[PDB]
């Protein structure tokens, strides 16, 4: 049987691929041009030689079934796999202009060519399979290029979209052509014309859109079944194509272009190893195909192609190889004002990269051969194969190779400075560690005798790319580009520890790379503000469902299951009957279905009983009990021509179907309810990354520019941005609670389960948990993280109450949150009403429970604050005048605390974690945050990092001495909260929130009670 042999060849075919892949990698040429040689030797071989001719003719000759049936949907399919989808979705209307429009005028040019030119005399619809064949690109050795050579990503994903969206296409029109050409078909009508298009363009999306709806779905309720999840993405793809092309007729390439797209959209629902494994998974496949598909045009090209091929015909093919570029420059010329005004825009230089770039692939190879083993005997077979190889073969050689060279020639390989400079600082760093290293080496007795002349040359690392007004001016530009730097590096290091996603990251760093080629320019809250903002159709969606949704536990489902049940019959004997107008169907069906309409009419009865008469007040059960009434009057007087019979067939069949939908509205709520978080997520991560990198970026240039000028301007600039976008975010919450509160909940629930698994890679390099278990912890870890992609996508804003419950202060102790939860006094405000203003005397705390506060107020502070802030906190502790105003923005909400019920819970309340102590820690550590920062900023620790780090200390006891000593072998960091310090020695005086320098091995204070002294420390994370 073939089944066994095939597979040999198969082998053969990729031991053959592996061999020209590897001895001519550093050749210019590539390697399938190899493979094509390959092939034709070996077919020369068989024409020849019986013995290997017996083998080879059984298996080289492939039927138009399997080429179109699996290997096109394997190459279409990993091609789109294997794509950026964002940035795609990005350019999606350029790149789809150009692929459709340009495909089709170039097609019909290379026919109207092909029909001129040739002497073949072809019709029409060959010289369309023929231009179909032509226009089928593969550009994957060029995207190679433009992704190592310069940030071009642009021009990269807008040409690997092209080729994709045009060898679909290209597919499509080969397939409608092929059936005129050699399946030929009686005069089909304009209408029958018009289904067939829409079948194969419009069906096609459709069906791929639901099958990968569906899978991606299944897929999120998986945990910890990497196989499984392996299995049905691929059965998924081929199910797909199968059902789509052959039993549905609708176009499979299309659906499994869409499948793939959206598969590789939703990468979170996919645990990480699957998405890695099926990444190498298909490449390999599509590298398999390419082998294959090569190997048979050498084979049979050499065997019965060629010998029909006179001098002419390479005359011809050099024509159609000048034509073909010329054609697909001119269309890049033509739509060049449409795609210049949308969308990234086509650069005069990028037209030409595009032009040159258009390498044909296996696609059109594949085709040709599908066109050949349907000619059979025919010239036009060989013709079609001759010219599509040669072709393929003239890309491959003259554009594969002199790309390179073109692109220097353009100017576009030259790398920039700034990633030279960045490249050469990363080497020497490299370079120094390696010298540290190697120096360390020598000193162990067990390597002394190494011969370090090998090592130092086997471990070497070479660089791969080996006060006048005009001077002010000169500075200004230089600090802003430091700035714009210092921005780019605060993103990246924000997404190397997870603050943020993937897609915020590539667009703040779009944004700050943008920004910088643009004079005096920085990144603007206007330009973001697009992020954030949400398209107004799905609000408006929300709005107008929620008015249409607005008598046990299940009286309600038992009705919707009993219409889901009763459907099969109404939709199939009423359109099975008229085939069948066996008995005994019909005679169950009658009295059944009858019978069911009554059990409806009588539990809709039970229920007006259960509720009163009142039941028929809902607008929905007038319906219902219309169409109960409709049923009633035709069954009744059926009981008692067609036209009188039809009444029911189709009339009540369309009838009973509309009373479902009153389901499917709450379902449609809970997914417009997930586009906006969608959207909202997005918005919230870019903006709070933006003022993260704002603040550090702050502290930084701080140091960094001497200029006082300069400074001063800079920080005004960074602190005018970061308020707008804050304000703009916190109006948002106020726009939409529950989705917010979703997010939010989102976000923490992740952080924590991060910092988890930190926690356990610490433990295992530690030793202190083995090797083992920590792969089940983390198992644990991972379906839990898995758990939140499927977390309501709204959830209810608590009641204060809870908000109160949860203060870090109040927390831990039920006794205390009942006797504080007695006190507190709600309070409400107006727009603009102040709550406290500056230097006022001290009243009590404000807990904010709902809108937006300003803080305006001397250290110059200037901020908003939001829900679950605690704000008057230092008064009540210092007892002193207020530092800041504190305005309300929107419709403000707080709990008040009055200054006499906090000194009487904090004399009541005073176990170990004293309620003072824990009100003075959430004070030390606002306050101590940015001291550290200004301190470490220079250094690798985060914002996030200071403040977890800080989390560990402890508020000193600071009663058994007035002077403290301080061992720096045990202890970190020394902060002063509150209270006059000096130092023993030096006696120097410090009476500010400090940080304590190290020299200072001991404090000393005093015992007078106008400023208690409150000292934060941070200890070591061994003892003590
Ligand atoms: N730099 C700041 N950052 C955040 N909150 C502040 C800042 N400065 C002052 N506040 C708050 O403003 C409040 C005004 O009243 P209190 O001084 O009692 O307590 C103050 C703090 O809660």
Not at 117 to 132: H, Q, R, T, V
Not at 825 to 841: A, C, N, T
Not at 873 to 899: D, H, S, W
């Amino acid at each position: 049987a073939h089944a066994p042999k095939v597979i040999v060849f198969i082998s053969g075919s990729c031991l053959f691929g592996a061999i020209s892949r590897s001895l001519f990698k550093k050749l210019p040429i590539p390697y399938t041009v190899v493979l094509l040689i390959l092939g034709a030797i070996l077919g020369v071989v068989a024409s020849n030689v019986p013995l290997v001719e017996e083998h080879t003719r059984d298996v080289a000759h492939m039927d138009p079934h399997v080429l179109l049936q699996i290997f096109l949907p394997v190459l279409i399919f990993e091609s789109a796999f294997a794509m950026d989808v964002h940035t795609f979705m990005r350019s999606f209307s350029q790149v789809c202009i150009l692929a459709l429009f340009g495909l089709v005028v170039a097609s019909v040019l290379t026919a109207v060519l092909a029909m001129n030119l040739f002497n073949y005399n072809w019709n029409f619809s060959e010289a369309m399979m023929f231009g179909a064949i032509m226009s089928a690109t593969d550009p994957v050795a060029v995207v190679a290029l433009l992704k190592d050579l310069g940030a071009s990503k642009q021009l990269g994903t807008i040409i690997e979209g092209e080729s994709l969206l045009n060898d679909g296409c290209a597919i499509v029109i080969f397939n409608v052509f092929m059936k005129m050409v050699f399946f030929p078909q009686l005069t089909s009508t304009v209408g029958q014309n018009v289904l067939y298009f829409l079948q194969v363009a419009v069906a096609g999306p459709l069906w791929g859109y639901a099958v990968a709806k569906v899978t991606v779905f299944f897929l999120s309720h998986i945990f910890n079944d990497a196989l499984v999840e392996i299995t049905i993405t691929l059965a998924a793809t081929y199910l797909t194509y199968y059902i789509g092309d052959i039993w549905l007729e609708v176009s499979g390439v299309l659906a499994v272009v869409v499948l793939g797209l959206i598969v590789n959209a939703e990468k979170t629902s996919i645990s990480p190893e699957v998405e890695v494994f099926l990444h190498r998974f298909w490449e390999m496949l599509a590298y398999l195909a390419n082998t294959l598909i090569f190997m048979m045009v050498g084979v049979v090209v050499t065997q019965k192609a060629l010998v029909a091929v006179d001098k002419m015909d390479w005359f011809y093919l050099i024509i159609l190889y000048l034509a073909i570029t010329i054609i697909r420059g001119m269309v890049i010329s033509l739509f060049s004002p449409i795609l210049s005004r949308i969308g990234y825009g086509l650069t005069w230089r990028n037209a030409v990269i595009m032009t040159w770039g258009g390498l044909r692939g296996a696609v059109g190879l594949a085709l040709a051969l599908v066109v050949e083993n349907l000619a059979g005997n025919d010239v036009i077979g060989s013709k079609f194969l001759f010219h599509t190889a040669g072709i393929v073969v003239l890309t491959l050689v003259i554009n594969a190779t002199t790309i390179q060279t073109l692109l220097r020639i353009l100017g576009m390989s030259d790398i920039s400075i700034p990633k030279r400079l960045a490249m050469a600082g990363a080497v020497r760093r490299i370079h120094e560690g390696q010298n540290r290293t190697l120096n360390m080496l020598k000193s162990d007795r067990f390597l002394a005798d190494a011969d370090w002349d090998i090592a130092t040359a086997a471990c070497e690392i070479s660089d791969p790319y080996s006060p006048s007004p005009r001077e002010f001016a000169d500075m200004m530009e230089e600090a802003r580009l430091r700035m714009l730097k210092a921005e780019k590096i605060s993103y990246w290091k924000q997404f190397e520890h997870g603050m943020l996603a993937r897609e915020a990251l590539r667009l703040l760093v779009q944004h700050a790379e943008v920004a910088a080629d643009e004079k005096d320019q920085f990144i603007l809250v206007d330009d973001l503000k697009k992020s954030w903002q949400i398209k107004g159709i799905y609000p408006w969606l929300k709005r107008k469902l929620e008015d249409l949704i607005s008598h046990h536990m299940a009286f309600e489902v038992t009705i919707n299951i009993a219409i889901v049940l009763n459907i099969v019959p109404i939709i199939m004997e009423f359109v099975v009957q008229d085939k069948m107008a066996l008995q005994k169907i019909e005679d169950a069906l009658r009295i059944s279905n009858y019978v069911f309409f009554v059990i409806y009419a009588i539990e809709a009865i039970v229920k007006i009983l259960g509720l009163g008469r009142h039941y028929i007040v809902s607008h929905w059960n007038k319906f219902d009990a219309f169409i109960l009434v409709v049923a009633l009057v035709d069954i009744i007087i059926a009981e008692t021509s067609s036209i009188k019979v039809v009444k029911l067939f189709r009339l009540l069949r369309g009838l009973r179907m509309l009373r479902l939908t009153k389901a499917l509205i709450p379902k449609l709520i809970l997914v417009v309810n997930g586009k906006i978080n969608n959207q909202l997520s997005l918005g919230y991560d870019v903006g709070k990354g933006y003022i993260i990198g704002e603040e550090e970026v702050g502290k930084i240039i701080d140091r960094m520019v001497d200029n006082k000028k300069i400074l001063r301007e800079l920080k005004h600039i960074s602190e005018t941005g970061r308020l707008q976008v804050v304000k703009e975010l916190g109006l948002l919450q106020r726009e939409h609670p529950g989705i917010a509160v979703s997010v939010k909940t989102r976000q923490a629930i992740r952080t924590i389960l991060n910092h988890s698994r930190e926690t356990i890679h610490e433990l295992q390099g530690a030793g202190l948990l083995d090797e083992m278990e920590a792969h089940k912890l983390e198992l644990t870890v991972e379906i839990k993280m898995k758990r939140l992609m499927n977390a309501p996508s709204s959830i209810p804003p608590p009641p204060p109450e809870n908000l109160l419950k949860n203060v870090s202060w109040l927390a831990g102790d039920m006794k205390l949150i009942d006797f504080i939860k007695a006190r507190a006094s709600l309070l409400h405000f107006d727009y603009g009403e102040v709550i406290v203003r500056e230097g006022d005397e001290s009243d009590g705390l404000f807990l904010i429970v709902s809108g937006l506060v300003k803080l305006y107020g001397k250290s110059v502070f200037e901020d908003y604050l939001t829900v679950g802030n605690v704000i008057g906190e230092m008064g009540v502790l210092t007892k002193k005048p207020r530092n800041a105003t504190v305005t309300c923005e929107t419709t403000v909400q707080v709990y008040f605390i009055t200054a006499e019920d906090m000194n009487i819970a904090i004399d009541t309340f005073t176990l170990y974690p004293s309620l003072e102590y824990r009100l003075w820690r959430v004070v030390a550590i606002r306050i101590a945050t940015p001291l550290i920062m200004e301190q470490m900023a220079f250094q690798g620790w985060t914002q996030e990092k200071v403040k977890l780090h800080l989390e560990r200390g402890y508020l000193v006891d600071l009663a058994e001495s007035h002077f403290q000593f301080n061992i720096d072998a045990t202890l970190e960091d020394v902060i002063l909260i509150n209270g006059t310090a000096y130092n023993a020695h030096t006696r120097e005086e410090i009476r500010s929130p400090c940080l304590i320098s190290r020299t200072v091995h001991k404090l000393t204070f005093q015992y007078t009670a106008t400023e208690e002294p409150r000292l934060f420390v941070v200890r070591n994370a061994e003892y003590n």
